[PDB]
Amino acid sequence: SGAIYVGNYRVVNRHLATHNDWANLVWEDSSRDLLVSSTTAQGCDTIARCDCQTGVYYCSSRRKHYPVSFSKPSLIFVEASEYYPARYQSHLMLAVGHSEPGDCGGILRCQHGVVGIVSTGGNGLVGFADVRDLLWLDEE
């Protein structure tokens, strides 16, 4: 589990969105595994607007942050899970790192800010849904 809190937005994995998220919906995209809902309180996270390919992510199944090198956002085939059939997910970045299903939502960040959230993994890989192209998260 986990979210990004930027401005009056809450960014979560679409497959983990709550009823309150759906009832306060701003934007969602199944192909990216992302959903954004509106918040009453202002958040403290800032979004990175950069080209970093190295950063650090939070792994809840280890209670630890790990440094990683990750690929550029791309269209990657993701195995079936209880939430989606086997399919291509867009804007996904892969790295070598530990992950388990419940690790979705952990933040990946660089020196510029938040880059994305854990969205996929297995067998010593971890994948992150990029948010750096979503420029509208910085306004409203």
Ligand SMILES: COc1ncccc1NC(=O)N1CC[C@H](C(N)=O)C1
């Ligand atoms: C961190 O994810 C994992 N970690 C280990 C094995 C398997 C996984 N993957 C998952 O549980 N899913 C749930 C939905 C998600 C997606 N399609 O974006 C992939």
Ligand SMILES: [Zn+2]
């Ligand atoms: Zn950066």
